[PDB]
Amino acid sequence: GFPLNEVTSGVWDADEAILLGADWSKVVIGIRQDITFDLFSEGVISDSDGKVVLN
Amino acid sequence: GFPLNEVTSGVWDADEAILLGADWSKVVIGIRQDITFDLFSEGVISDSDGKVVLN
Numbered sequence: 190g191f192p193l194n195e196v197t198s199g200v201w202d203a204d205e206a207i208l209l210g211a212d213w214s215k216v217v218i219g220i221r222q223d224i225t226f227d228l229f230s231e232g233v234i235s236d237s238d239g240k241v242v243l244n
Numbered sequence: 245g246f247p248l249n250e251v252t253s254g255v256w257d258a259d260e261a262i263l264l265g266a267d268w269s270k271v272v273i274g275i276r277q278d279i280t281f282d283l284f285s286e287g288v289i290s291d292s293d294g295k296v297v298l299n
Contacts, residue, residue, distance in 0.1 A: 231286040232299070239296035 191210075234243040289298040 229286050233288050233296065235288070235296040235299050239291070241296065 232244075233241050235241055287299075288296050291297050
């Protein structure tokens, strides 16, 4: 009689767990900044060594 | 009879001089470009050797 959600997104590891039950009001997510998109046309993609890979 | 302009910035090295007197009409500053501020959000800070240091 409780809501069941099968986790279809590929995150689940069946070798670690089968099921999790919880009081979901005791789990909290803080949204500091909502999903933000910026578009750019100047500048560089660069390596960790500081080499340019796309200008 | 001349104003005693004390230099209150940190520039004055008092181990070099106590006072400087002059004909101030003989001292000229030429301004070519006034203090200019620009803000950047695309681009790179780079090394003397072409390496990227901040992107």
